[PDB]
Design a binder for these strands. Sequence first.
RNA 1: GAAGUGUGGACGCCAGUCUGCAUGGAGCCGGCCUUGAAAUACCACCCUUUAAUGUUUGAUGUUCUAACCCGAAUCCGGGGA
Length: 222
Amino acid sequence: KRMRVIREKVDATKQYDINEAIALLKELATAKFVESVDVAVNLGIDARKSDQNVRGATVLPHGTGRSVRVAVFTQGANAEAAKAAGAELVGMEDLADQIKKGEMNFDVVIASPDAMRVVGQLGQVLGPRGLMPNPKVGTVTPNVAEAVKNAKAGQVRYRNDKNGIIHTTIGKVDFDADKLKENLEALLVALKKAKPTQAKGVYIKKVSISTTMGAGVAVDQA
RNA sequence: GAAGUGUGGACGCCAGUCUGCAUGGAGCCGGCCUUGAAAUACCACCCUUUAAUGUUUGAUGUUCUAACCCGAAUCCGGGGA
Protein backbone atom coordinates (compact mmCIF):
# COMPACT_ATOMS: atom_id res chain seq x y z
CA LYS A 1 0.00 0.00 0.00
CA ARG A 2 0.96 3.66 -0.43
CA MET A 3 1.26 3.25 3.34
CA ARG A 4 4.40 1.29 2.45
CA VAL A 5 6.14 4.54 1.54
CA ILE A 6 4.45 6.32 4.45
CA ARG A 7 5.43 3.70 7.04
CA GLU A 8 9.12 3.53 6.14
CA LYS A 9 9.11 7.23 7.03
CA VAL A 10 7.52 6.93 10.48
CA ASP A 11 8.48 4.81 13.50
CA ALA A 12 5.54 3.90 15.75
CA THR A 13 7.97 3.11 18.57
CA LYS A 14 10.00 6.33 18.41
CA GLN A 15 8.59 9.49 19.98
CA TYR A 16 9.71 12.35 17.73
CA ASP A 17 9.90 15.93 19.00
CA ILE A 18 7.81 18.93 17.96
CA ASN A 19 10.14 20.33 15.29
CA GLU A 20 10.88 16.82 14.01
CA ALA A 21 7.17 15.97 13.90
CA ILE A 22 6.25 18.84 11.59
CA ALA A 23 9.18 17.93 9.34
CA LEU A 24 8.18 14.29 8.94
CA LEU A 25 4.58 15.52 8.85
CA LYS A 26 4.98 17.30 5.51
CA GLU A 27 6.32 14.26 3.65
CA LEU A 28 3.37 12.30 5.05
CA ALA A 29 0.91 14.65 3.35
CA THR A 30 1.92 13.62 -0.17
CA ALA A 31 -1.58 13.63 -1.67
CA LYS A 32 -4.17 15.85 -3.35
CA PHE A 33 -4.82 19.49 -2.40
CA VAL A 34 -3.51 21.02 0.82
CA GLU A 35 -3.85 18.60 3.74
CA SER A 36 -5.06 19.82 7.13
CA VAL A 37 -3.05 18.67 10.15
CA ASP A 38 -4.49 17.98 13.60
CA VAL A 39 -3.12 17.29 17.08
CA ALA A 40 -4.58 14.48 19.18
CA VAL A 41 -3.47 13.86 22.77
CA ASN A 42 -4.66 11.47 25.48
CA LEU A 43 -6.27 13.10 28.51
CA GLY A 44 -6.49 11.38 31.89
CA ILE A 45 -9.76 12.68 33.31
CA ASP A 46 -12.96 11.02 34.52
CA ALA A 47 -15.14 11.17 31.40
CA ARG A 48 -18.67 11.16 32.86
CA LYS A 49 -17.94 13.90 35.41
CA SER A 50 -18.66 17.35 33.99
CA ASP A 51 -15.95 19.02 36.07
CA GLN A 52 -13.49 16.77 34.24
CA ASN A 53 -14.42 18.00 30.76
CA VAL A 54 -11.93 20.28 29.03
CA ARG A 55 -13.13 23.08 26.75
CA GLY A 56 -11.68 26.41 25.69
CA ALA A 57 -9.93 28.34 22.93
CA THR A 58 -6.36 28.99 21.79
CA VAL A 59 -5.06 31.88 19.69
CA LEU A 60 -3.63 29.82 16.82
CA PRO A 61 -2.17 31.32 13.61
CA HIS A 62 -7.41 34.46 9.28
CA GLY A 63 -11.03 34.60 8.19
CA THR A 64 -13.07 37.13 10.15
CA GLY A 65 -15.44 39.89 9.07
CA ARG A 66 -18.14 40.54 6.47
CA SER A 67 -16.72 37.51 4.66
CA VAL A 68 -17.75 35.15 7.48
CA ARG A 69 -21.00 33.37 6.64
CA VAL A 70 -23.30 33.24 9.68
CA ALA A 71 -26.11 30.71 10.09
CA VAL A 72 -28.74 31.54 12.72
CA PHE A 73 -31.39 29.16 14.06
CA THR A 74 -34.19 30.73 16.11
CA GLN A 75 -37.93 30.46 16.73
CA GLY A 76 -40.92 32.78 16.48
CA ALA A 77 -40.19 36.49 16.15
CA ASN A 78 -36.53 35.70 16.84
CA ALA A 79 -36.39 34.65 13.19
CA GLU A 80 -37.21 38.15 11.95
CA ALA A 81 -34.72 39.76 14.33
CA ALA A 82 -32.05 37.53 12.80
CA LYS A 83 -33.03 38.44 9.24
CA ALA A 84 -32.97 42.21 9.78
CA ALA A 85 -29.75 41.63 11.72
CA GLY A 86 -27.73 40.61 8.69
CA ALA A 87 -27.47 36.83 8.99
CA GLU A 88 -26.95 35.27 5.55
CA LEU A 89 -28.77 32.08 6.54
CA VAL A 90 -31.83 32.14 8.79
CA GLY A 91 -34.37 29.50 9.78
CA MET A 92 -35.94 27.33 12.47
CA GLU A 93 -35.53 23.66 13.38
CA ASP A 94 -36.59 22.83 9.82
CA LEU A 95 -33.15 23.76 8.50
CA ALA A 96 -31.74 21.07 10.78
CA ASP A 97 -32.56 18.59 8.01
CA GLN A 98 -30.82 20.29 5.10
CA ILE A 99 -27.54 20.50 7.01
CA LYS A 100 -28.03 16.81 7.73
CA LYS A 101 -28.40 16.26 3.99
CA GLY A 102 -24.94 17.66 3.29
CA GLU A 103 -25.27 21.44 3.34
CA MET A 104 -22.28 22.82 5.26
CA ASN A 105 -21.77 26.11 3.41
CA PHE A 106 -21.28 28.31 6.48
CA ASP A 107 -18.58 29.52 8.87
CA VAL A 108 -20.32 30.22 12.19
CA VAL A 109 -23.68 29.05 13.54
CA ILE A 110 -25.78 31.12 15.95
CA ALA A 111 -28.98 30.03 17.69
CA SER A 112 -31.36 30.54 20.61
CA PRO A 113 -31.62 28.54 23.90
CA ASP A 114 -35.17 27.31 23.25
CA ALA A 115 -33.75 25.39 20.29
CA MET A 116 -30.56 24.08 21.89
CA ARG A 117 -31.70 20.59 22.89
CA VAL A 118 -32.95 19.83 19.38
CA VAL A 119 -29.68 21.04 17.85
CA GLY A 120 -27.73 19.26 20.57
CA GLN A 121 -29.05 15.91 19.35
CA LEU A 122 -27.44 16.77 16.01
CA GLY A 123 -24.24 18.04 17.59
CA GLN A 124 -22.18 15.00 16.60
CA VAL A 125 -21.38 16.71 13.30
CA LEU A 126 -20.92 20.30 14.50
CA GLY A 127 -19.36 19.22 17.79
CA PRO A 128 -15.93 18.11 16.49
CA ARG A 129 -15.66 21.03 14.05
CA GLY A 130 -16.57 23.34 16.92
CA LEU A 131 -19.64 24.65 15.09
CA MET A 132 -22.00 23.90 17.98
CA PRO A 133 -23.37 27.09 19.62
CA ASN A 134 -22.48 27.56 23.30
CA PRO A 135 -23.21 30.11 26.09
CA LYS A 136 -19.62 30.80 27.18
CA VAL A 137 -18.67 31.16 23.52
CA GLY A 138 -21.30 33.89 23.37
CA THR A 139 -22.99 32.01 20.54
CA VAL A 140 -26.23 31.24 22.37
CA THR A 141 -28.39 34.06 23.73
CA PRO A 142 -31.91 35.56 23.39
CA ASN A 143 -30.58 38.74 21.77
CA VAL A 144 -29.44 36.90 18.65
CA ALA A 145 -29.65 40.20 16.77
CA GLU A 146 -26.73 41.47 18.84
CA ALA A 147 -24.88 38.15 18.64
CA VAL A 148 -24.57 38.22 14.84
CA LYS A 149 -23.54 41.88 15.01
CA ASN A 150 -20.92 41.42 17.73
CA ALA A 151 -19.57 38.65 15.51
CA LYS A 152 -16.82 39.21 12.94
CA ALA A 153 -14.63 40.24 15.88
CA GLY A 154 -12.44 37.15 15.84
CA GLN A 155 -10.99 31.25 18.19
CA VAL A 156 -10.48 27.51 17.66
CA ARG A 157 -12.65 25.79 20.27
CA TYR A 158 -11.86 22.28 21.50
CA ARG A 159 -13.92 19.68 23.36
CA ASN A 160 -14.66 15.94 23.48
CA ASP A 161 -17.19 13.38 22.20
CA LYS A 162 -17.76 9.61 22.61
CA ASN A 163 -14.81 7.38 21.57
CA GLY A 164 -11.55 8.49 23.23
CA ILE A 165 -9.08 11.38 23.67
CA ILE A 166 -8.98 14.96 22.27
CA HIS A 167 -7.54 17.03 19.37
CA THR A 168 -7.84 20.19 17.26
CA THR A 169 -6.77 21.55 13.87
CA ILE A 170 -3.23 22.95 13.92
CA GLY A 171 -2.93 23.98 10.28
CA LYS A 172 -1.98 22.68 6.84
CA VAL A 173 0.99 20.78 5.42
CA ASP A 174 1.77 23.50 2.88
CA PHE A 175 2.86 25.63 5.85
CA ASP A 176 6.57 25.77 6.69
CA ALA A 177 8.18 23.64 9.41
CA ASP A 178 8.75 26.60 11.73
CA LYS A 179 5.16 27.81 11.41
CA LEU A 180 3.50 24.46 12.11
CA LYS A 181 5.61 23.63 15.17
CA GLU A 182 5.01 27.21 16.30
CA ASN A 183 1.34 26.23 16.49
CA LEU A 184 1.66 22.73 17.93
CA GLU A 185 3.44 24.16 20.97
CA ALA A 186 0.87 26.93 21.39
CA LEU A 187 -1.97 24.41 21.39
CA LEU A 188 -0.26 22.16 23.94
CA VAL A 189 0.32 25.16 26.22
CA ALA A 190 -3.33 26.18 25.90
CA LEU A 191 -4.33 22.62 26.80
CA LYS A 192 -2.23 22.09 29.93
CA LYS A 193 -3.76 25.30 31.27
CA ALA A 194 -7.23 23.86 30.64
CA LYS A 195 -6.46 20.87 32.86
CA PRO A 196 -9.17 20.49 35.54
CA THR A 197 -8.14 20.72 39.20
CA GLN A 198 -9.88 17.48 40.20
CA ALA A 199 -7.96 15.70 37.43
CA LYS A 200 -5.30 13.49 39.01
CA GLY A 201 -2.38 11.69 37.40
CA VAL A 202 -0.79 12.25 33.99
CA TYR A 203 -2.97 14.73 32.09
CA ILE A 204 -1.48 14.03 28.66
CA LYS A 205 -0.87 10.28 28.55
CA LYS A 206 0.38 10.52 24.97
CA VAL A 207 0.62 13.23 22.30
CA SER A 208 0.33 12.43 18.59
CA ILE A 209 0.54 14.87 15.68
CA SER A 210 -1.50 13.44 12.80
CA THR A 211 -3.18 15.07 9.81
CA THR A 212 -6.74 14.23 8.77
CA MET A 213 -5.17 11.10 7.28
CA GLY A 214 -1.41 10.64 7.35
CA ALA A 215 0.79 8.19 9.29
CA GLY A 216 0.07 8.99 12.93
CA VAL A 217 3.21 10.22 14.68
CA ALA A 218 3.64 10.27 18.46
CA VAL A 219 5.48 13.27 19.91
CA ASP A 220 6.66 14.67 23.24
CA GLN A 221 4.51 17.52 24.55
CA ALA A 222 7.60 18.91 26.28
C1' G B 1 3.40 -1.66 12.40
C1' A B 2 4.27 -6.23 3.63
C1' A B 3 -0.86 -10.04 3.90
C1' G B 4 -6.45 -6.85 1.57
C1' U B 5 -9.17 -8.96 -3.81
C1' G B 6 -11.41 -11.87 -7.74
C1' U B 7 -12.07 -18.20 -6.42
C1' G B 8 -6.58 -18.70 -0.91
C1' G B 9 -6.75 -20.47 5.44
C1' A B 10 -8.36 -21.97 11.10
C1' C B 11 -8.06 -24.48 17.95
C1' G B 12 -13.25 -23.80 21.40
C1' C B 13 -18.45 -22.89 16.77
C1' C B 14 -19.41 -19.15 11.68
C1' A B 15 -16.89 -13.92 7.45
C1' G B 16 -14.64 -8.49 5.52
C1' U B 17 -8.37 -6.88 5.22
C1' C B 18 -3.27 -7.23 8.22
C1' U B 19 1.69 -8.94 9.31
C1' G B 20 7.79 -12.48 9.53
C1' C B 21 3.85 -17.83 4.24
C1' A B 22 4.39 -18.89 -1.46
C1' U B 23 4.38 -17.19 -5.08
C1' G B 24 0.93 -15.19 -11.06
C1' G B 25 -3.78 -10.75 -13.11
C1' A B 26 -5.43 -8.01 -11.93
C1' G B 27 -3.80 -2.86 -12.24
C1' C B 28 1.39 1.06 -8.46
C1' C B 29 -2.95 2.08 -2.59
C1' G B 30 -6.02 2.14 -2.74
C1' G B 31 -10.74 -1.71 -2.66
C1' C B 32 -13.22 3.02 -2.28
C1' C B 33 -15.07 5.10 -3.56
C1' U B 34 -23.21 7.85 -7.45
C1' U B 35 -26.51 -0.25 -9.16
C1' G B 36 -33.58 -1.90 -5.97
C1' A B 37 -33.52 -8.33 -4.68
C1' A B 38 -25.38 -8.43 -3.68
C1' A B 39 -24.32 -0.36 -1.43
C1' U B 40 -19.69 6.19 1.78
C1' A B 41 -14.24 9.42 5.35
C1' C B 42 -12.08 12.15 11.77
C1' C B 43 -10.41 11.88 19.66
C1' A B 44 -15.66 9.67 27.08
C1' C B 45 -21.43 7.69 27.01
C1' C B 46 -26.75 1.61 26.89
C1' C B 47 -21.77 -3.58 23.93
C1' U B 48 -18.60 -0.06 27.40
C1' U B 49 -20.52 -7.73 25.86
C1' U B 50 -19.33 -12.18 24.41
C1' A B 51 -15.17 -16.05 23.34
C1' A B 52 -9.89 -17.76 25.00
C1' U B 53 -5.44 -17.66 28.25
C1' G B 54 -2.26 -16.76 32.88
C1' U B 55 -2.46 -15.29 38.30
C1' U B 56 -5.61 -14.80 43.14
C1' U B 57 -10.04 -16.89 45.11
C1' G B 58 -15.34 -19.38 46.72
C1' A B 59 -18.34 -24.15 46.75
C1' U B 60 -18.83 -29.52 45.50
C1' G B 61 -16.90 -34.69 44.55
C1' U B 62 -12.25 -38.21 44.48
C1' U B 63 -7.33 -39.99 46.10
C1' C B 64 -3.40 -39.66 49.39
C1' U B 65 -1.40 -38.00 54.32
C1' A B 66 0.47 -35.91 60.30
C1' A B 67 -4.27 -35.18 64.16
C1' C B 68 -7.98 -38.24 66.62
C1' C B 69 -10.34 -43.21 68.24
C1' C B 70 -10.01 -48.56 69.10
C1' G B 71 -7.17 -53.47 69.51
C1' A B 72 -1.92 -54.99 71.19
C1' A B 73 3.32 -55.66 75.97
C1' U B 74 5.72 -53.76 72.20
C1' C B 75 6.48 -53.71 67.24
C1' C B 76 2.49 -52.92 65.04
C1' G B 77 -2.53 -53.50 63.27
C1' G B 78 -7.76 -51.76 62.15
C1' G B 79 -10.58 -47.49 61.30
C1' G B 80 -9.97 -42.63 59.23
C1' A B 81 -10.44 -36.30 58.72
